Amino acid sequence: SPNSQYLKTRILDIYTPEQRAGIEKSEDWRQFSRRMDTHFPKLMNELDSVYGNNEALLPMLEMLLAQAWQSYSQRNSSLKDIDIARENNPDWILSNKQVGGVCYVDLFAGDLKGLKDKIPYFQELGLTYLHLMPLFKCPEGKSDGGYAVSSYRDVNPALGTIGDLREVIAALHEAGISAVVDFIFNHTSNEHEWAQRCAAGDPLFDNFYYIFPDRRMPDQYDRTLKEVFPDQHPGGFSQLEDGRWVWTTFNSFQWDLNYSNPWVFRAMAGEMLFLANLGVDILRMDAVIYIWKQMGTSCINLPQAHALIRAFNAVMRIAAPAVFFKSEAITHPDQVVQYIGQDECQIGYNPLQMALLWNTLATREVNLLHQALTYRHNLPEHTAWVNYVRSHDDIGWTFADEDAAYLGISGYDHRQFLNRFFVNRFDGSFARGVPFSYDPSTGDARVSGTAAALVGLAQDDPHAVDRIKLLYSIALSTGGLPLIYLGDEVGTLNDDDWSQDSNKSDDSRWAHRPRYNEALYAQRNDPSTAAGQIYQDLRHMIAVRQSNPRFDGGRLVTFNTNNKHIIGYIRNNALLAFGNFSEYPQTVTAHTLQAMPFKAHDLIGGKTVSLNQDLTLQPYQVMWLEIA
């Protein structure tokens, strides 16, 4: 294998002898050269572990690092300052100061100029982090809500221009908000140029996808693949018009990119550098678990997938140190956590906590959630969870069967229950969700619907507002970067048109993707409305989280409440949180509370609470007790 110095001297060969002296003296080159020395050995080792003795490895690497230099050279000074700051503060992601939000630009604000106009509201709410849903050109009609990308460089004209996006990102930065966008790197749309050229037999785009002459290999792969959108097509493959078959994990119009080809890595690394220099702070690594395939396996969570992401990481350490990764791994908890690491994805979605929040509302029993906060919450140094309550996607019940079994719970039977409960097919349920991707091979299903819909707000259940408050309280206080699904903070209900819209009718996820509700947002300062109560509740919890150092960092220790309806945990040995998941009053006894100070201030309700006696929580009450 080559070395950092060799590669750098060749990178510099593009310059005249005179220019070259100016380059090597420059501050940009000095930073690049030391980051090369520090981080290139990781890049080389990760790529070697995947591609081995591949003839194209060295040429690809040289091409990539030449592009990395050009990119860093071009990178504007303000981003270069953020590079230095995050280079010396790996734990910026772990600060209690951070609170995130996510929205569709079109649905929430019409277009990018409109989004820029909403930035004062984001500041009002207290966001420091904003994820904008996929922005770029995609097929008209059905594009999986923009996740079928037809060009990585062209903004969807309905949203505006690439210049508009650069301005939004600058404006977010001026408002103290990090910009977060999707890195859609497992697949492109079938109308993407790479996809067209590859299928047409253009040598330049040879092996950019997985294309087969017939069903022989697809059938063999499909023996072990687990379907993602079972309504859409069987297995993992779709047929071309000419009779061939292409790997399509998701929709038929989404074709998996072939990372066994090192030129595909270079292509997407190139795209990563492009987004970096737009000033993107965090890249959402979409569908991370699918980027390596192997016959005889489920083709998810494979070792090469992890190595490839660690390779991407090193590219950012070299040419855009500010750019962090957020893992989207919705899979078994044992596998979810393997993506999270300083040298891989520094943060990742926490689907286990999310799914168990909803589980606990249904059962009123904190057993699985306590188990999860006890054994699966704490992370390696310099990493964090992203804690959420809802997202643009369905809810999957991705708790571990092994975990549940230890508690005498059958995972299969339990999911059968949860899936009936949350779509209002269980006696007494407050939930008004909609099924998604029922699967006749597994009996599996997921749940669509907004947070407000799932807690009972549609029928104005008197407990609805408190349920929302409780759920968000836990994401805001367990440790990690909390992510608000924008619209939830005023109690936004399910979309009313999705089911009869022919572009949407086969995808119930659109139920929980409503437009900005003008009426609700106008009520947000009136505490007599559900919108105002939710908003003031959440805003208060956000303010406390961000101001109070007891919430800092990602670590927690659970507290045994000895009440199966009440969750308990302690942050920084100074903040005792209780959450009552029962619709009835529930008590933590004086005996349980013996080690606590006699009195403690509750940050939620503002009162001084006695802990030297029974503590009785009202229905769905949350307490944040300052015990040190």
Ligand X SMILES: OC[C@H]1O[C@@](CO)(O[C@H]2O[C@H](CO)[C@@H](O)[C@H](O)[C@H]2O)[C@@H](O)[C@@H]1O
Ligand Y SMILES: OC[C@H]1O[C@H](O[C@H]2[C@H](O)[C@@H](O)[C@@H](O[C@H]3[C@H](O)[C@@H](O)[C@@H](O)O[C@@H]3CO)O[C@@H]2CO)[C@H](O)[C@@H](O)[C@@H]1O
Q: Which residues bind ligand Y (CB under 6 A)?
A: 362-365, 409-410, 413-414, 417
Residue 15 contact partner, candidates ligand Y, ligand X, none, CB within 5 to 8 A by sort of partner: ligand X
Out of 77, 88, 528, 594, the residue judged to bind ligand X by CB under 6 A: 594
**595 lines the binding site for ligand X (CB under 6 A):** yes
Report the site for ligand X in 435-494 (rule: CB under 6 A). Answer: 435-438
Across 460-469, b (16+ Cβ under 10 Å) vs e yields: ebebbbbbbb
Out of 68, 127, 314, 434, the residue judged to bind ligand X by CB under 6 A: 434
Out of 559, 578, 620, 624, the residue judged to bind ligand X by CB under 6 A: 559
**Which of the residues 83, 227, 281, 286 is marked catalytic?**
286
Q: Which residue, 52 or 440, is less far from ligand X as judged by CB? A: 440
Q: Which residue, 178 or 558, is less far from ligand X as judged by CB? A: 558
**For 10, what's the count of Cα atoms within 13 Å in the CB-facing half-sphere?**
15
Q: Which residue, 160 or 568, is less far from ligand X as judged by CB? A: 568
What is the dihedral sign for C-alpha 46, 49, 50, 55?
positive
CB of 413 to ligand Y, least distance (A): 3
Spell out the alpha helix ranges (H) of 178-331. 193-199, 216-222, 262-277, 303-319
What is the total count of residues that contact ligand X (CB under 6 A)? 21
CB of 234 to ligand X, least distance (A): 13
Owner of token pair 């220019």: 19
Residue 502 contact partner, candidates ligand Y, ligand X, none, CB within 5 to 8 A by sort of partner: none
Residue 438 contact partner, candidates ligand Y, ligand X, none, CB within 5 to 8 A by sort of partner: ligand X
CB of 231 to ligand X, least distance (A): 5
CB of 368 to ligand X, least distance (A): 18
Residue 529 contact partner, candidates ligand X, ligand Y, none, CB within 5 to 8 A by sort of partner: none
How far is Cα 231 from Cα 240, in angstroms, rounded to an integer? Answer: 19
Closest CA to 99 of 548, 527, 455, 520: 548
Report the site for ligand X in 10-29 (rule: CB under 6 A). Answer: 12-13, 15-17, 20
Parallel, antiparallel, or unpaired: how do β-strands 237-239 and 245-247 relate?
antiparallel
Q: Which residue, 195 or 362, is less far from ligand Y as judged by CB? A: 362
Breaks (C-N over 2.5 A) in the chain follow: none
Task: Quickly count: other Cβ atoms within 10 Å of residue 334's Cβ.
Answer: 12
Residue 559 contact partner, candidates ligand X, ligand Y, none, CB within 5 to 8 A by sort of partner: ligand X
Taking contact as CB under 6 A, which single stretch among the options 62-70, 463-471, 479-487, 589-597 is the one that binds ligand X? 589-597
Q: Which residues pair with 578 in a beta bridge?
A: 568, 623
Q: Which residue, 414 or 446, is less far from ligand X as judged by CB? A: 446
Residue 365 contact partner, candidates ligand X, ligand Y, none, CB within 5 to 8 A by sort of partner: ligand Y
How far is Cα 202 from Cα 610, in angstroms, rounded to an integer? Answer: 74
SS (H, E, C) 24-91: HHCHHHHHHHHHHHHHHHHHHHHHHHHHCCCCCHHHHHHHHHHHHHHHHHHCCHHHHHHHHHHHCCHH
How far is Cα 51 from Cα 333, in angstroms, rounded to an integer? Answer: 28
Residue type, 238: S
284 is in an annotated binding site: yes
Report the site for ligand X in 40-69 (rule: CB under 6 A). Answer: none
Q: Which residue, 414 or 550, is less far from ligand Y as judged by CB? A: 414
Tokens of 345: 């994805």
393 is in an annotated binding site: yes
Task: Quickly count: other Cβ atoms within 10 Å of residue 626's Cβ.
Answer: 16
Taking contact as CB under 6 A, which single stretch among the options 113-121, 179-187, 214-222, 505-513 is the one that binds ligand X? 505-513
Given a contact cutoff of 8 angstroms between Cβ atoms, the answer to whether 109 and 486 are in contact is no
Active-site annotation holds for 365: no
Q: Is 63 exposed, middle or buried (0-12, 13-18, 19+ CB in 10 A)?
A: middle
How far is Cα 490 from Cα 496, in angstroms, rounded to an integer? Answer: 17
Residue type, 612: N
Taking contact as CB under 6 A, which single stretch among the options 310-318, 333-341, 360-368, 434-442 is the one that binds ligand X? 434-442
Task: Quickly count: other Cβ atoms within 10 Å of residue 191's Cβ.
Answer: 18
Residue 594 contact partner, candidates ligand X, ligand Y, none, CB within 5 to 8 A by sort of partner: ligand X
Q: Which residue, 387 or 558, is less far from ligand X as judged by CB? A: 558
CB of 179 to ligand Y, least distance (A): 41
**573 lines the binding site for ligand X (CB under 6 A):** no
First to last CA, the chain: 55
Residue 410 contact partner, candidates ligand Y, ligand X, none, CB within 5 to 8 A by sort of partner: ligand Y
Active-site annotation holds for 193: no
How far is Cα 289 from Cα 338, in angstroms, rounded to an integer? Answer: 10
**Which of the residues 182, 191, 328, 507 is marked catalytic?**
328
Rg over alpha carbons for the chain, rounded to the nearest Å, is: 25
Out of 560, 573, 612, 613, the residue judged to bind ligand X by CB under 6 A: 560
Residue 507 contact partner, candidates ligand X, ligand Y, none, CB within 5 to 8 A by sort of partner: ligand X
154 is in an annotated binding site: no
CB of 499 to ligand X, least distance (A): 6
Out of 106, 286, 444, 507, the residue judged to bind ligand X by CB under 6 A: 507
Across 127-159, b (16+ Cβ under 10 Å) vs e yields: bbbbbbbbbbbbbeebbbbbbbbbbbeebbeeb
515 is in an annotated binding site: no
Out of 508, 529, 548, 563, the residue judged to bind ligand X by CB under 6 A: 508
Applying CB under 6 A, which residues contact ligand X? 12-13, 15-17, 20, 231, 434-438, 506-508, 559-560, 562, 592, 594-595
Tell me the catalytic residues: 286, 328
Annotated binding site for substrate: 144, 187, 254, 284, 392-393, 509
